[PDB]
Amino acid sequence: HHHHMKRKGIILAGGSGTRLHPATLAISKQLLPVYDKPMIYYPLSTLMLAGIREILIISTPQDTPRFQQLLGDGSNWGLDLQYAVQPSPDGLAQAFLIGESFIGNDLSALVLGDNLYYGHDFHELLGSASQRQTGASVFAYHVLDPERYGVVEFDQGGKAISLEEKPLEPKSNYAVTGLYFYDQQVVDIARDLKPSPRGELEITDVNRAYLERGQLSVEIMGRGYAWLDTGTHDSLLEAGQFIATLENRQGLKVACPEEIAYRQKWIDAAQLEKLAAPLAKNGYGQYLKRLLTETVY
Amino acid sequence: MKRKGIILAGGSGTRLHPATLAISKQLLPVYDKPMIYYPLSTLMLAGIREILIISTPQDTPRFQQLLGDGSNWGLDLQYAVQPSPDGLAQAFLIGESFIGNDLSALVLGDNLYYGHDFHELLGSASQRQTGASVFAYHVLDPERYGVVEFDQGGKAISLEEKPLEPKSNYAVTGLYFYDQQVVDIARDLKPSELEITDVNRAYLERGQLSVEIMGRGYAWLDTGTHDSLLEAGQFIATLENRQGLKVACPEEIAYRQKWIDAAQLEKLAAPLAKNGYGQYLKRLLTETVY
Amino acid sequence: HHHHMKRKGIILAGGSGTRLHPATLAISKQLLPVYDKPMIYYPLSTLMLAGIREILIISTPQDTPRFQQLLGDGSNWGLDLQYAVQPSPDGLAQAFLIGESFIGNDLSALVLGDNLYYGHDFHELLGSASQRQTGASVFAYHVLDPERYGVVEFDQGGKAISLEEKPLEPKSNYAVTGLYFYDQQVVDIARDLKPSPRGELEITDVNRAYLERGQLSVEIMGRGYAWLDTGTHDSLLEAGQFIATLENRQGLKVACPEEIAYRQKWIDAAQLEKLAAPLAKNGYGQYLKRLLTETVY
Amino acid sequence: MKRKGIILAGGSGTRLHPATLAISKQLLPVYDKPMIYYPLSTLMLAGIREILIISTPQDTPRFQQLLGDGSNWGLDLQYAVQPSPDGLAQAFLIGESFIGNDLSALVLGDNLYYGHDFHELLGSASQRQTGASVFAYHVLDPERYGVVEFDQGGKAISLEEKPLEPKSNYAVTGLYFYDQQVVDIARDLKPSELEITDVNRAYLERGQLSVEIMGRGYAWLDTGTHDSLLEAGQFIATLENRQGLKVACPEEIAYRQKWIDAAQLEKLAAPLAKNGYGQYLKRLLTETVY
């Protein structure tokens, strides 16, 4: 027949299996707080910073109602939030099959629900990835332990020439972060994925697909950014200390969704005033109130 | 006489919202385990095996899922709800039939204790068949708590809940031992909240309150703020990683109290075998820890 | 008679009096480590990032030999380091009287020896301040406790219109950080300063002087930067945790002077190899060695 | 018999360079006070007032400036140098004339201890007039230390310094009590370094080594890395800020041992009056701390 561009977001905030049991037995990792807010506020704030307003949250059946209770339909923050369940954790690239109907014919963005980013001109780094309407965009960050991640190899010109998932002998220390930008080809790339030996559909196979077509942009997220680790109990604790230090220093919050919707002009002063009221007695609501007065450059 | 325990893990209101908007504080981890493991481990260390967990209606199912009926750790867990947050002393009205004609002990679900000879320090409270024991602890901010005042001879002469002008820096901790009188004292309480400090004052007036000092060489950790939640997890991380030993591991404590045997400990470590907690429980079977 | 532009740096790493006694009784604050290196490496690294190679370190008479033992004459790192003593702490603006001969007819830069900065495109933020050959440049950063600092007030257009030192009622939450860029007028501005009521020559009077002549640029250092606090034992501990978290995450060091001189091309591979050798057994020397191999973007 | 003390605060080589390039580790603060205050406070808590500080030649003047002759805190401090880092047992050759015919105790200048009833735990070692006492502590990484092996009955049967295959996870801590034999045992040692574990093995072979367990409810903190230095300061910050009480404050401990009086404590707090440490010492004059 005959047919005659915006970008949707997906947050994968599914099962971390038993790795962090028993800490995570009664509740999933992405609802645990990092200092003063739930973990999912951070990657959600990241999507919002990319200008993305229509967002699918993928979680386990057990925990979806709790994600729904925390976040609603998004209307309070100028967003539209929908929900989908992942019955079993079959790999990150399942997000695109699970989210196939949500995505439709649009461009998309995947963020892991346990990743947090901090640093200056992050809005602008996401802007270039979001503005690119063709191909895929990922970010490479220097890490101590690249063997844990998808690793990107660069030629002497600085061109990305290979990707490898958890290599025993990394070709560089540049890990692919858990924020991915995709055009309309990804659902089709995802549907042709064959499981890997450990029973998972690998995002690195999706990104390699783009690489082999010449449509993978790999931007460096520099060392002046913090891409923090929530993979261990220890790293979770370091992520909370990190955010506490920045917030207590500056009197500004990292990854406050109310604030970000306010600054984007997705909600207005009066709506922000309403969101503050039920939290007026604690520091978070008193912080939302203070935003109405102050110019923050 | 057998002593029954109660963990009160009720609501903290909106004070830590949005961090606790999704789920109650006592289910969140402190470092490597759910917060409630810590006060539970305290009761177990006092020899207490029959225990009532009281939480909000929304969250009981989840305490219940986490901990079950206790039988896997040689405990006998029961559960009950606190519909609204109307004071710690409701624990004894909600827990009345559970307690029966027995001695009891109440620990708050968010209190963490650490230190040497804690088993002994709780032994002396536990073995008192008569009266009540509580613990006083020096703190920077006594206004936040029940404050005990002492005479020059070291005798408790008043308790005050959240006084504007604390009489001392001694704060009553969230661990309480009681005889058969506490239910009836709980039942005649009048709202101020139904205050645990009124329960303890009732025993004080009758010369039946033992106020033992919990010395400066014990850790009574603060989980009342986001900052103090953090310091607590850092505090436990430092101890566990220095020693290769875990703080408030119920499976280990059951095993050491001989409430479960080596074969049961082995089955418990099986599901967790690929991570550090299972590896740890496996390592306990063949190492002597003094 | 008849006469016929580079920028020199000064690090003020003098007396913190008795405020941090007894921690600082046997040694000055600026030699205490922040995680894995001495505190003075951080502000020194900041000057180096601004392209500054000729640097005066001002310390107490008691501690100069220890600053000299740590840092030498700078030749090992492609720098020229000189030393001057401050017999009594009479205020930060004394740096210009103490450093009058060192400065000569050049432009200058003052950094406090206990300030540390982290964040992306810091090189570029310093570049604009350093390239400005006229007037003064300072940086304003949002803090929880502006009452502790020099506070900058902005009009609705975002123009700086006043400065106040430790105001009881701050006009904004924007504090002036401890990095200052100056033209050839500063030594003369400094020499006319009259002590303040508490017996100190105030840098805020110097900056107000520039403001009243229309030659103070106040650039915002955004919230995506960390300007960390070493004013208390607590904040010192948070600064060390902060740097440990970033360094252990990335496998890169913050404020490694050897690395920065290497990357600037002030020293070469073989010199860096020599600086590594006496530290080869510890993580710091093994890190200097690894830099010779790897491309870090 | 009077027992004299030695703090060994010698060189850590280049291991923490460049952080310690400027000055030795034991002069750096842990949170709010210089590291050496902590092992010093340990000796004081054991009743030890006559103390020899041994440090590198470069740094002695500065230990000497920091601490003086001790008289202001009711101590009697002396000082001596360790020219090179040739093993902890040199402490007894360097300290030989200082020790004389007396009993002695050696603490490493970078060891931190915390916990309840520490005064008592050191009392039982201190009061032994014969033989040597050391402390064993469970740790994750016993290879880094002197490792003690026990028989099924809990008796020490071997000590090994930094074994490649530790026999247990029990590590000997950096606090050692000795009788009059240690100098002569130190003097017959042969370089392996002159090893403190050889000194302790000499007493073991003669049935004269008391190996007491320092339980899991005590903190023996690690200052051997940059990471463990940090965890230690965080650990002390959390205790001091929770309690409003300081850990290892020599002035306070002198005052409580009645080695200095209220008027002396008052003069000590005067120079520090504008900061928290002086304010703290002033606050100790009019508060009862149990």
Ligand SMILES: Nc1c(NC(=O)c2ccccc2)c(=O)[nH]c(=O)n1Cc1ccccc1
């Ligand atoms: N840039 C901001 C902002 N600022 C904005 O989102 C913003 C939005 C529109 C215009 C200007 C600034 C904020 O309010 N909170 C915040 O954490 N950041 C940093 C951030 C945001 C999301 C994820 C990681 C870091």
Ligand SMILES: Nc1c(NC(=O)c2ccccc2)c(=O)[nH]c(=O)n1Cc1ccccc1
């Ligand atoms: N004392 C123990 C023990 N020891 C025991 O449970 C025990 C009990 C009876 C006999 C032998 C060991 C332990 O295994 N785990 C633990 O965390 N502690 C300390 C502790 C226990 C509860 C709360 C805070 C600290």
Ligand SMILES: Nc1c(NC(=O)c2ccccc2)c(=O)[nH]c(=O)n1Cc1ccccc1
């Ligand atoms: N930008 C760098 C760099 N990179 C450089 O200095 C550099 C120098 C010349 C060209 C490219 C990069 C570094 O090596 N270490 C470092 O801590 N930073 C960040 C930094 C440097 C100084 C003060 C605060 C943060």
Ligand SMILES: Nc1c(NC(=O)c2ccccc2)c(=O)[nH]c(=O)n1Cc1ccccc1
């Ligand atoms: N026990 C005390 C005390 N208590 C005393 O010194 C003391 C000694 C004799 C009688 C009464 C109190 C103190 O004041 N400060 C302190 O840090 N402690 C614990 C301690 C002391 C040294 C090292 C590690 C922990």
Ligand SMILES: [Cl-]
């Ligand atoms: Cl960067």
Ligand SMILES: [Cl-]
């Ligand atoms: Cl104690």
Ligand SMILES: [Cl-]
């Ligand atoms: Cl920014």
Ligand SMILES: [Cl-]
């Ligand atoms: Cl113990």
